[model samples]
Target chain A: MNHKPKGTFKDYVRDRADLNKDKPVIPAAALAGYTGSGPIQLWQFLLELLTDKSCQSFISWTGDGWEFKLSDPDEVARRWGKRKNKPKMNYEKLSRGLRYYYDKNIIHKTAGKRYVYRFVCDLQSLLGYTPEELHAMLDVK
Target chain B: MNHKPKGTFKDYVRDRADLNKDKPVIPAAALAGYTGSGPIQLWQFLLELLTDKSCQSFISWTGDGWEFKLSDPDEVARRWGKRKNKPKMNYEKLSRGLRYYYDKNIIHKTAGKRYVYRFVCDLQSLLGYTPEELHAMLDVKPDADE
Candidate 1:
């Protein structure tokens, strides 16, 4: 509470000279590519593949690139946890992550269906890839 | 290849239906915040940490807020890589991202100096918090500072 800081105006200088080595930055941007600041990964590849759902079991695309579903709800949390190394990350928190992407124009859900979602951005364009290469790398059958 | 100054306007939409299987909406104030946008992080904590540096390594304030030295050049690149999600990001390209901050008044290295630059704004005031309590704020443990 009481410390000395040497400055022209000691009154204005706060008594702190060390930063916490443990504190992570940007609470919400704690994804695989988050670092308190940018280039902010508004959405990740998992977000993309699942966007074209019909692939992964817990979640898969309804068709190609526009819609998908969260089939095995808890399984998603487990898988998502693995992807980001969060261990206990869940679908609710996952929803917050999706909420995050909304601003990035990544993915969204309408009010009519259950677990139904789609890609808002052009996958081919956004990632700058031959999406087949993407699909090839993805487990799309 | 070709050039466009004020380049590319894109629109994107995503959806949801049932609360059980469901979903989410902003499209603006968007791009810079995209973690996918390589070399994207800008103007924040680290610049603050490296300020008033009679302490810390990799960087040290040159006895003033307006100028500083990249005492450990590679350390700067490595940390920038850690922050920007570009494990491969290096100083060659890292400098470009630093340049990106120039327009925003976060930094500028072109004067009588070569690249000895420092943060341009008084961050504590800009952050609207004391440099003391910011230690508390940045600490996720809830009680790191007194």
Candidate 2:
């Protein structure tokens, strides 16, 4: 159930755009209380990825991080690169930034792995909702 | 050091505002997260009180509701009421909200006759800092300041 097929960052970008299409984009100041980053753009994207129900897990390494087991890594990355307009996009920089989360206690390295990272906070407690409640809210059954 | 003097809510409010004039206001969202009341105006006021470093502790009750005591409760309540333009305000409604906090686990009733309620989450931890780090950042002298 934790498996994710390989995909690119573009796929994730599109997914985020679609999901947030309805709600008014919250101003950065409104989000300052929640994130130390001082702005919404970067954290907003990351939050979407982390909150994605279909994304059971992820791996953070040095380069363009991998969405392994995703249906298509190339297409995913392609879309991601396109959206960010980073035609030369790859996993290296993505992994580097991800490494920073380790020190911040935002993410943890998967034991015995070089690039894999997992969430450390209990999603339920952090979000103030039980996993069962999340599943029900998401209609995951 | 754990012995907090008993005072009225009014006294606690005045001391808190004077002590915390420069502290950044706690966002409404963070307050709501603690109370689970969605969003209440009184909560905004309560957040300001609890977030102050001077207001070290407080208490709440269930039957008739909660009561917050500081070194001087009457002044605290007076200052708070004046600030909110509620000149006729007293401790009754304030106590009701304190009770809400008790039920939500945002605070807990203290043991014995103190009728005090304590914050459930350490303010330092909520702000993403350890207790030692918080004290260091606040420039609190371990031996002299407390």
**Highest DockQ scorer:** 1
Among the numbered candidates, top lDDT falls to 1
Candidate 2, after superposition: displacement of residue B134 in Å? 4.1
Model 1: DockQ against the native? 0.03
**How many angstroms is residue A135 displaced in model 1 relative to the true structure, after the best TM-score fit?**
45
Q: After superposing candidate 2, which stretches have Cα over 4 Å from the reference?
A: A1-141, B1-20, B25-44, B53-69, B83-85, B113-115, B121-126, B130-146
TM-score of chain A of each: 0.53, 0.43
C-alpha RMSD (angstroms) for model 1:
17.9
DockQ value of candidate 2: 0.01
Each candidate: fraction of true contacts kept? Answer: 0.00, 0.00
CA lDDT of every candidate:
0.46, 0.42
lDDT of each residue in A29-141, candidate 2, tens digit only: 32332333433343234434333544333411122221122233344344345434568855655555556766766656566645455544443333334434434443433
Tens-place lDDT per residue, model 1, B1-146, is 11123221111111111211111011111212221322234444244334322224555445443355666766677766665456986667767877887887777774776557756656444333444443333221211131
